[PDB]
Design a protein around this ligand. Structure first.
Ligand code: SF4
Ligand code: SF4
Ligand code: SF4
Ligand code: SF4
Ligand code: SF4
Ligand code: SF4
Ligand code: FES
Lengths: 226, 140, 142, 454, 575
């Protein structure tokens, strides 16, 4: 089932007329001064045995080179992102020799049967609160929430409630409320969500403390924090 | 009393002019090449026990501007060097200041002696940094 | 005796107001044929670009002066001084504290920030050469 | 399809295209600012001027704009005509009258489209001696810095942000030579696709703030073709490194998937690579003490204990590569290999795989999404997870205006005519979520309900 | 203009080639070389070549022979399909015209017939083409490596070969020990040349250091390549502007003479005509360096074959010339002062008084030199008939300069093909009486030194007014005072020193009269900001190739005198 990955990119013996594909622009600077504060003797250039690319500027990045993997776009007289026009067949089209990437599976000749597993209609329960998942572009992903520039772009941790359910609980916007998941206790400030239906509880998925496995789970206890 | 064997070759020995088994000093100048490097290694071997080597110029200190397939990147790769004199080409006064910087090593002895840790970068620092005004370059 | 245009030791100069003249634009590093300049841009809270570190490998340098003529601030200049010599090649690597001198060198009066549109302390918008005052879009005058 | 005559030579081009996108495909360099391949032609900057003749014998013609001129069969144009060249130089000269002296301290320097076109026209001598107009700046949030003095009024930013990306908080203000591009007041740009403005703006007005902390020029970068790791869409990227740290994230063109645009999580979420807390050497514990090992020591130390163990299991990850999971699977055996995701998340993923492989329904690429005529979104808050699909779905909803304009014989590149014909007519889009989504401004109906009700 | 692209179809050599081989047997390329360029097939190379050798005003000299890779050349409109190419530059003195023949090759079949039978100077050129590219010349007697050592795998001017030393593994001395052992066991396998042979094989190594294997003179074989710096390869990894320092180091005595053909060739690709003040300034610096080189040749010539006590005063005069050069340019040697479109700065305001002091100072010394060398008998007796050659030997081996002019062939480049405004000056071309030897060559140089001082007299009194840089968008860099104040000038300066100036796809070619012989630059642009191919023709390579033909029948002392008389430097030879 993973046989297509061989054709996704060429191997480390692929050459453009004997040249390896370059990683650095041809005007790359500081070769004899970058590492000169540790040792004045220039080290050897890193050697890549895994891929067709070289850890240097001594290689090829021609717009008309027969390849699909283009590390960066540059042309004579076009130093900006507008240099991608030289690498396409028609401007705004596909890359000249084809876009990189291959589809592992093609469309099957025959389809499936109809799924007859229709769920019953949702009903709220006293005590149990369904966890409605809320996702954020700048908080829900594991690696990128550890970026320091994302700390201010992500919102404050909250807990979203229907107005009728917050009226039954007795809270308003901003009140810190406590709940129990799996024997643990987390306290969060309440936010009010009119479009959220009653019996549900909005949590931000993938944050520091709220795992995405919690989607579709249940909160047994919910009360004002003291 | 220092006896100099000058192996200056091209475009770096023209300043030296303006400035076997008998020498104790080898003043390597010029570009050191991959093809001719055994010649300098045998001439270094021929000399007697108390050797001193002065590298002058960027082509002998490093490869200089010739970071190219046919040039070795410095004479210090294969022979020990004592003094380095930057420039392309250096000056006769620099050659004089090299012999003056080397007699201090000849009179200071493992010849570091914990006194050669002081460097001209730090020693002439308060001289060079206090400079404010320089002559305008539209005049002779 | 040396002429004024002599190509010896490379220094970094200062403004007549006393700040370092280098704005870490990296044009001197790229224009060098030997690749003997490394630097990184830093920025003050005032907003002034300046080099975090400036490193010249004088073992490699050929004193061609292409760095001086590349510089759009007159910060890097070549001085009449050939007196250099060291026991170690590692001591031919000069940092910014070995290169930054106390005055403006060959060009006593040029300040780049007075030309530049970018706003730093002492020069808000419209306080540069041949620059008018900013007009807001909400202004009553058509 | 069509044949045109350019500067005496003869070429074969597509008739539906305009003259700028025809001639740029043939390798004929015409300067331009306001045109974009994604955004279409509006005709504002007047930089793309060519001389057009009526036939082969007409010696004195007229200056037209090649972005606004169709490449019909029988077209006679001259890029290198002297009057066209002088006018194109004058357009650069008029833009240079109010431009600040900022290239050493501009982050667009060396990667600036205005710098390239100024050289390409061959305008190097200043005649203007009067004062320059200045603007104050806005705060646009933690990602994008603002410098309005560098603006050339090409209108690419507003055409991308409002028309293409359907953002609401960027507009043009003022009139005549005092036009101001920005927000009504300071604050964060609300769009999830705000960061494409750094590539879309041909000057240094909108620049990457995350890159200006550790800035380096483009020629000092080391680039590799890479894939975004922040979600499942697979946008092609070109990460750049200097001095051992990842510096910026650039869009890598792929005409099948992402083309010119990335999302903000992909563009700005790279900072975890540059953390000081990452392990750089193998580390072995000894009670409370920690021992640092090299690669050879770590392998010999680990396999001594692994030989003495009676059963070794392996836990993979969805954020690890295919070669990394397989190698883990090869080390413990396939009977001892676990995926690392929960059982309920595993059950939804293999059912999602089953309908793609065995459903018999084609699954479109990210750019093929923009050709569809109706979209039903069930449960997936797609702007927050898979954000480039939401950008692709907005373009699909605009297909209704393209169909009406085609019936009235308006060309595909004349975007302001197509938008005028449309007048809020949309292809139908029906989204279901537990709350409101960011696709609600263009959706025909929104259904807020629990997941069983969806 | 003198830079516009021409096919040279009105040259009379093409019409007689049409009437001899037909219209379908070649293909004409439109260049900016100034000469016709014709693509011929390799099966017709010898027929076309020997046809030009017996034209009624024949092409007598093979100027250059080298190769191009051409595999990564994207702009190839009009050319035949080539994977490699070999060019042949031929010169007719009687027509004052040149022709270039280009042979196209495929990557599997790098084979072309040798040109050595027609023109003897082609032997070293084909060995270099075999060394640096992988073209095999069929019929070559000793086709071995002339630049790199004999165990060097790889052809360094191929485009798949990495240029930089850092890209290879450093000097770990694994190969230094093996090369040392090989050099220690210096023995003759009878492969180092013809080597027919009782016979004592001796290696003698002496203004440059090189080895020669001599048979004791029955046979002598120069071994060169000890000073190879990869200058031609360096042109591919440097921009057009940042390559300029490397030009100054092809010849150490040349200085600004060496920069002149390169900047003139780049200005043809740029389409720049320079102002008159640029022409007079460039001619001034080139005649100053020419005087310095000629005084060095006359000085060193008098020291080896005579008493060196009076002529040591010439060091003070060379010190005055170096002080005047570093007053104008900045630095005594390797100025790197010529720019694309002009020079680096204007002349400083006190230049006239120093040049006037040098022009007043020089005639007394010059007339003492004429007395010291023209009237002497001992050096004249040791320099007359010492390895002499004539006009037939000069034109065979591509010998130019004082050598060629010492025979009856009056051929200067400054009069035949004027460059840099040399045609607006009043100077004479000295010439010998048909025999080129050691006395005649030195006497010619004394006459040339006086003519150079006449050119400097006209430069001081007719120095015109105006810019030191052309007004053109490819003038690199722009004037700095405009760069420091004006944004469009700053934008042009920003991209020119960083990415580089964009030269459009063409081929240019310039020849200048150098301090020693004729130096040329053949530059190819593929439309980028770096050169695709840079070819440097140095006359010393031909002059050093000519010595085994003339020294055969002489002593070792005659070899030392002949080597001291010829105008050769090993930096020129190996580049
Ligand atoms: S250091 Fe400079 S002057 Fe000396 S040999 Fe090398 S290039 Fe020539
Ligand atoms: S020295 Fe000049 S060119 Fe170099 S970084 Fe500083 S301002 Fe830029
Ligand atoms: S003088 Fe030349 S070699 Fe030295 S740092 Fe400046 S550009 Fe580099
Ligand atoms: S936007 Fe471009 S032209 Fe304007 S200052 Fe920045 S780099 Fe220079
Ligand atoms: S801000 Fe940038 S994209 Fe917008 S109009 Fe100005 S120059 Fe064009
Ligand atoms: S949609 Fe955004 S996060 Fe997902 S792959 Fe593309 S750029 Fe990365
Ligand atoms: S690009 Fe055509 S008018 Fe602006």
């Amino acid at each position: 089932e993973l046989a297509g990955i061989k054709d996704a990119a060429p191997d480390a013996t692929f050459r453009i007329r004997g040249q390896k594909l370059a990683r650095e622009p041809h005007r790359y600077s500081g070769r004899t001064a970058m590492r000169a504060n540790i040792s004045v003797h220039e080290p050897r250039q890193p050697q890549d045995i895994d891929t067709m690319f070289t850890f240097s500027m001594e290689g090829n990045n021609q717009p008309t080179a027969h390849r699909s993997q283009v590390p960066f776009a540059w042309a004579p007289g076009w130093n900006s992102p507008q240099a991608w026009n030289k690498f396409q067949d028609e401007v705004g089209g596909k890359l000249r020799f084809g876009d990189p990437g291959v589809r592992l599976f093609e469309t099957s000749e025959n389809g499936l049967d109809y799924f007859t597993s229709v769920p019953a209609r949702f009903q709220p329960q006293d005590g149990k609160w369904r966890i409605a998942p809320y996702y954020h572009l700048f908080g829900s992903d594991e690696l990128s929430q550890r970026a320091p520039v994302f700390q201010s772009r992500m919102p404050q941790p909250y807990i979203k409630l229907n107005p009728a359910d917050a009226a039954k609980l007795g809270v308003n916007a901003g009140t810190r409320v406590s709940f129990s998941y799996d024997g643990n206790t987390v306290t969060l400030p309440v936010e009010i969500a009119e479009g959220l239906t009653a019996g549900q509880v909005g949590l931000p998925m993938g944050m520091s403390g709220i795992a995405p496995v919690l989607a579709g789970a249940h909160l047994e206890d919910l009360k004002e924090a003291q | 009393s220092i006896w100099p064997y000058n192996f200056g070759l091209s475009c770096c020995y023209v300043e030296m002019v303006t400035s076997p088994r008998q020498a104790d000093l080898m003043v390597v100048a010029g570009t050191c090449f991959t093809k001719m490097a055994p010649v300098i290694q045998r001439l270094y071997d021929q000399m007697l026990e108390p050797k001193w080597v002065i590298s002058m110029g960027a082509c002998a200190n490093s490869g200089g501007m010739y970071d190219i397939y046919s040039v070795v990147q410095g004479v210090d790769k294969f022979i020990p060097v004592d003094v380095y004199i930057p420039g392309c080409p250096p000056r006769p006064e620099a050659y004089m200041q090299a012999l003056m910087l080397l007699q201090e090593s000849i009179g200071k002895e493992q010849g570091v002696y914990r006194a050669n840790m002081q460097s001209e970068r730090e020693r002439k620092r308060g001289e060079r940094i206090a400079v404010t005004n320089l002559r305008t370059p539209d005049e002779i | 005796y040396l002429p004024p245009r002599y190509r010896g030791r490379i220094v970094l100069t200062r403004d007549p107001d006393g700040e370092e003249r280098c704005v870490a634009c990296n044009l001197c590093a790229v224009a060098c044929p030997v690749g003997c300049i490394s630097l990184q841009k830093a920025e003050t809270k005032d907003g002034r670009w300046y080099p975090e570190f400036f490193r010249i490998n004088f073992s490699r340098c050929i004193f061609c002066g292409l760095c001086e003529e590349a510089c759009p601030t007159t910060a890097i200049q070549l001085t009449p001084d050939f007196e250099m010599g060291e026991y170690k090649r590692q001591d031919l690597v000069y940092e910014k504290e070995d290169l930054l001198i106390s005055g403006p060198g060959k060009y006593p009066e040029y300040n780049f920030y007075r030309m530049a549109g970018m706003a730093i302390d002492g020069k808000d918008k419209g306080e540069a050469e041949n620059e008018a005052k900013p007009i807001d879009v909400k202004s009553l005058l058509p | 399809m069509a044949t045109i005559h350019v500067d005496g030579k003869e070429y074969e081009v597509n008739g539906a295209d305009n003259l700028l996108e025809a001639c740029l495909s043939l390798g004929l360099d015409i300067p331009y600012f306001c045109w974009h391949p994604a955004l279409g032609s509006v005709g504002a900057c007047r930089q793309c001027a060519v001389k057009q003749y009526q036939n082969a014998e007409d010696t004195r013609g007229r200056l037209v704009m090649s972005c606004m001129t169709p490449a019909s069969d029988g077209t006679f144009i001259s890029i290198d005509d002297e009057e066209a060249k002088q006018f194109r130089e004058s357009v650069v000269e008029w833009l240079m009258t109010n431009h600040p002296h900022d290239c050493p301290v501009c982050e667009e320097g060396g990667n600036c489209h205005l710098q390239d076109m100024t050289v390409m026209t061959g305008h190097s001598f200043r005649r203007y001696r009067f004062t320059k107009r200045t603007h104050r700046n806005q705060d646009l949030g933690p990602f994008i810095s603002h410098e309005m003095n560098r603006c050339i009024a090409c209108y690419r930013c507003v055409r991308y942000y409002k028309d293409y990306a359907d953002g609401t908080d960027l507009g043009v203000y003022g009139a005549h030579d005092n036009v101001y591009f920005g927000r009504p007041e300071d604050g964060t740009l609300e769009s999830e696709f705000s960061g494409n403005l750094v590539e879309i703006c041909p000057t240094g007005v909108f620049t990457d703030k995350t890159h200006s902390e550790r800035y380096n020029r483009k020629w000092d970068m080391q680039f590799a073709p890479s894939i975004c790791q922040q979600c499942s869409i697979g946008c092609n990227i070109s990460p750049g490194e200097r001095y051992g740290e990842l510096r910026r994230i650039e869009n890598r063109y792929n005409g099948t998937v992402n083309h010119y645009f990335l999302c903000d999580r992909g563009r700005f979420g790279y900072g975890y690579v540059n953390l000081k807390d990452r392990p750089r050497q193998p580390v072995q514990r000894r009670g409370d003490d920690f021992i640092t090992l090299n690669a050879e020591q770590a392998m010999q130390g680990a396999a001594d204990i692994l030989r003495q163990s009676k059963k070794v299991i392996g836990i993979g990850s969805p954020r690890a590569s295919v070669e990394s999971n397989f190698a883990l699977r090869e080390l413990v055996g396939e009977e001892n290999f676990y995926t690392g995701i929960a059982h309920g998340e595993q059950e939804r993923l293999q059912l999602a795989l089953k309908v793609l492989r065995e459903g018999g329904i084609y699954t479109p690429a990210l750019r093929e999404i923009e050709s569809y005529d109706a979209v039903l979104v069930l449960g997936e808050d797609v702007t927050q997870t898979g954000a480039r699909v939401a950008l692709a779905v907005r373009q699909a909803v605009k297909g209704k205006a393209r169909e009406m304009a085609a019936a009235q014989k308006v060309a595909d590149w004349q975007i302001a005519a197509i938008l005028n014909i449309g007048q809020r007519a949309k292809h139908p889009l029906f989204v279901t979520n537990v709350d409101d989504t960011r696709l609600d401004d263009i959706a025909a109906w929104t259904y807020r309900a629990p997941v069983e009700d969806q | 203009p003198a830079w516009q692209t021409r096919d040279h179809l009105d040259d009379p050599v093409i019409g007689e080639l049409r009437n001899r081989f037909g219209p379908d047997a070649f293909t004409v390329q439109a260049t900016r070389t100034g000469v016709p360029v014709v693509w011929i097939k390799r099966e017709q190379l010898l027929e076309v070549g020997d046809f030009l050798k017996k034209l009624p005003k024949p092409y007598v000299m093979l100027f250059d022979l080298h190769g191009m890779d051409e595999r990564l050349r994207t702009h190839r409109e009009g050319l035949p399909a080539a994977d490699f190419s070999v060019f042949y530059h031929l010169i007719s003195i009687d027509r004052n015209r040149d022709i270039m023949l280009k042979v196209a090759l495929a990557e599997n079949d790098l084979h072309v017939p040798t040109f050595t039978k027609l023109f003897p100077n082609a032997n070293w050129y084909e060995r270099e083409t075999w060394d640096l590219f992988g073209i095999t010349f069929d019929g070559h007697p000793n086709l071995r490596r002339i630049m790199m050592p004999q165990t060097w795998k790889g052809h360094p001017l191929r485009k798949d070969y990495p240029a930089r030393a850092t890209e290879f593994s450093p000097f770990e001395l694994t190969k230094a020990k093996q090369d040392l052992e090989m050099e220690a066991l210096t023995f003759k396998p009878e492969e180092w040349g013809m080597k027919r042979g009782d016979f004592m094989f001796l290696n003698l190594g002496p203004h440059g250091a090189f080895r020669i294997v001599l048979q004791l003179i029955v046979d002598c074989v120069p071994d060169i390549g000890y000073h190879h710096r990869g200058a031609e390869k360096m042109g591919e990894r440097q921009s057009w502007h940042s390559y300029i320092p490397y030009t100054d180091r092809i010849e150490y005595l040349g200085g600004c003479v060496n920069e002149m053909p390169y900047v003139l060739a780049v200005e043809k690709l740029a389409g720049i005509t320079v102002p008159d003040r640029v022409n007079v300034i460039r001619v001034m610096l080139s005649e100053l360096f020419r005087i310095n080189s000629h005084l060095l040749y006359i000085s060193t010539f008098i020291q080896d074959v005579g008493a060196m006590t009076p002529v040591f005063f010439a060091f003070t005069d060379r010190q005055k010339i170096y002080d005047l050069v570093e007053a104008i340019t900045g630095f005594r040697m390797h100025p790197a002062w010529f720019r694309i479109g002009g020079v680096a700065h204007d002349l400083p305001r006190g230049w006239d008084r120093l040049l006037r002091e040098f022009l007043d100072w020089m005639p007394k010394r010059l007339a003492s030199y004429e007395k010291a060398a023209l009237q002497n008998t001992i050096l004249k007796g040791r320099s007359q008939g010492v390895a002499a050659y004539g006009a037939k030997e000069a034109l065979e081996w591509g010998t130019t300069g004082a050598g060629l002019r010492a025979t009856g062939i009056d051929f200067d480049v400054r009069k035949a093909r004027p460059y840099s405004g040399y045609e607006n000056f009043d100077f004479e071309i000295p010439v010998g009486g048909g025999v080129s030897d050691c006395y005649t060559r030195v006497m010619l140089k004394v006459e040339e030194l006086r003519q150079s001082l006449r050119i400097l007299e006209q430069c001081l009194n007719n120095m015109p007014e105006g810019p030191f840089k052309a007004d053109h968008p490819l003038t690199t860099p722009p004037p700095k005072e405009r760069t420091l104040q004006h944004i469009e000038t700053l934008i042009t300066h920003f991209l020119q020193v960083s990415w580089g100036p964009v030269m459009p796809a063409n081929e240019s070619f310039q020849m200048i009269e150098a301090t020693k012989g004729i130096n040329s630059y053949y530059l190819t642009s593929d439309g980028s900001t770096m050169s695709y191919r840079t070819r440097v023709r140095t006359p010393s390579f031909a002059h050093l190739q000519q010595i085994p033909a003339a020294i055969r029948g002489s002593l070792v002392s005659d070899l030392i005198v002949y080597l001291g008389s010829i105008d050769f430097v090993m930096s020129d030879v190996d580049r």
